[PDB]
Amino acid sequence: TFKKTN
Amino acid sequence: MKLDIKKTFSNRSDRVKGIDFHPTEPWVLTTLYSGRVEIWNYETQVEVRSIQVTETPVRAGKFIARKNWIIVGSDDFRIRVFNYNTGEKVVDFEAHPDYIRSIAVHPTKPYVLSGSDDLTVKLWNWENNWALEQTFEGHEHFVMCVAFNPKDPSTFASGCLDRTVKVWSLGQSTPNFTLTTGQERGVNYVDYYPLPDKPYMITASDDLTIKIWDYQTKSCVATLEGHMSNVSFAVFHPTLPIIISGSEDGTLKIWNSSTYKVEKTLNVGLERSWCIATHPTGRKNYIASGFDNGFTVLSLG
């Protein structure tokens, strides 16, 4: 997810 | 307030995920999404040293000035330590089987804490061959931020996407206490008020709020609302009566630490803000933040 990777 | 803010140095780069001030040289460390780390002298505006550490994001980085080191953590699961005078790699080990979000350095003992998406905080002892001395278990989602209590660094706080802060003691397996923040999208950041007069901590969340906590009573002292997207961090300034926050809304906000009202909103024009540092002894009241498109070092007063 974007939360994981941002 | 009259903040008369001055831009000391800003430069463009790939997304800055970690940032730290050196305590005695006019240097800032940045750690980038591209796997690179940079040390800049922000007074001369010259790059001191850079390293292409890895191909993965380097999410955390700190100086360990008393050893002439930087320590960094990256999505390849590794903690690496470099001597910043020689560039020599001092150690390189797998610290967690998942992303490393945050590293904290003990001020007087040879201890480092790392927090990870593996749901743990780990304590490493660099004088024991970087031994894993303790694993702190109990969080139920990614541990986003770890910080020692600067007034009692036998304790530290971890902030987690499980919506809690846990405060722990070195040598003890369970939290001294768990704060249920009510920040339902999780805690991205936790920090301590540095002075003896207030037993305060502060938390930032994707739920657009910042909350101040009394760690003796466990009460929420204040909720700071105003950011327009995820709040990446919030900190107490070490020498000025302000709180500084940063957000995926692209702003830094400076809040009055007495009234808890916003004093100034700064759009520094580098897109999303991810990380913060304050100069540890308040030299020129310096602060620095890292963003999608680079970093900025600002002076206050």
Q: Between chains, do A3 and B206 touch, taking CB under 8 Å as contact?
A: yes
Q: Does B20 touch chain A (CB under 8 A)?
A: no
B221: three-class secondary structure by DSSP: strand
Q: Cβ-count burial of B155 within 10 angstroms (0-12 exposed, 13-18 middle, 19+ buried)?
A: middle
Q: How far, in Å, CA of B146 to CA of B25, rounded?
A: 25
Determination technique for this PDB entry?
X-ray
Tell me the CATH number at B285.
2.130.10.10
Confirm whether B113 is domain-assigned: yes
Domain residue limits at B196: 8-301
Confirm whether B36 is domain-assigned: yes
Structure tokens at B272: 């999303």
How far separated are the first and last CA of chain B, in Å rounded? 11
Strand partners, B27: B41
In chain B, which residue's Cα lies nearest the Cα of A3? B206
Q: Does B148 touch chain A (CB under 8 A)?
A: no
Confirm whether B132 is domain-assigned: yes
Confirm whether B1 is domain-assigned: no
Confirm whether B13 is domain-assigned: yes
B92: three-class secondary structure by DSSP: strand
SS (H, E, C) B47-61: EEEEEECCCCCEEEE
Q: Are B76 and B97 in contact (CB under 8 A)?
A: no
Q: Are B207 and B234 in contact (CB under 8 A)?
A: no
Confirm whether B259 is domain-assigned: yes
Q: How many CB atoms lie within 10 A of CB B257?
A: 20
SS (H, E, C) B152-187: CCCEEEEEECCCEEEEEECCCCCCCEEEECCCCCCC
* Total of domains in chain B: 1
Chain-centre distance of CA B69, in angstroms?
Answer: 17
Confirm whether B142 is domain-assigned: yes
Q: How far, in Å, CA of B195 to CA of B142, rounded?
A: 29
Which amino acid appears at position B206 of this protein? D
The structure was resolved to a resolution in Å of 1.5
Q: Between chains, do B99 and A3 touch, taking CB under 8 Å as contact?
A: no
Closest alpha carbon to B69 in B47, B86, B44, B55? B86
Q: Show which of residues 70-129 on chain B sit within 8 Å of chain A, judged by CB atoms.
A: 99, 117
Confirm whether B155 is domain-assigned: yes
